[PDB]
Design a protein around this ligand. Sequence first.
Ligand SMILES: [Zn+2]
Ligand SMILES: [Zn+2]
Length: 115
Amino acid sequence: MDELRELLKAEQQGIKILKEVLKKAKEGDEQELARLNQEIVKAEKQGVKVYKEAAEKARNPEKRQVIDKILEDEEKHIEWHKAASKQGNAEQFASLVQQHLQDEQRHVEEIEKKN
Ligand SMILES: [Zn+2]
Ligand SMILES: [Zn+2]
């Protein structure tokens, strides 16, 4: 097969982390927040690596569209967090995490329907 389970797991991993970070944002530690941001970027970056591989292994261009779309969006997310790695505020950081969460949920929503 073309493999989808790890692809799903990657998005799930980020969602788990995002929910985790949102909690920890209330914990309110600078070192933790930096760690959390790095955790997110690392997962997203790896996801792009896997999705790129999957994109080439995409059987249908129709299915590739979905993957290719996500490929850009996860890179897009990394771009946002790269900015956060420069400067950011606590409230904004929590908001970024929650907004990112919504994006990933769409991806899972889109991917889970195997048709
Ligand atoms: Zn993402
Ligand atoms: Zn995603």
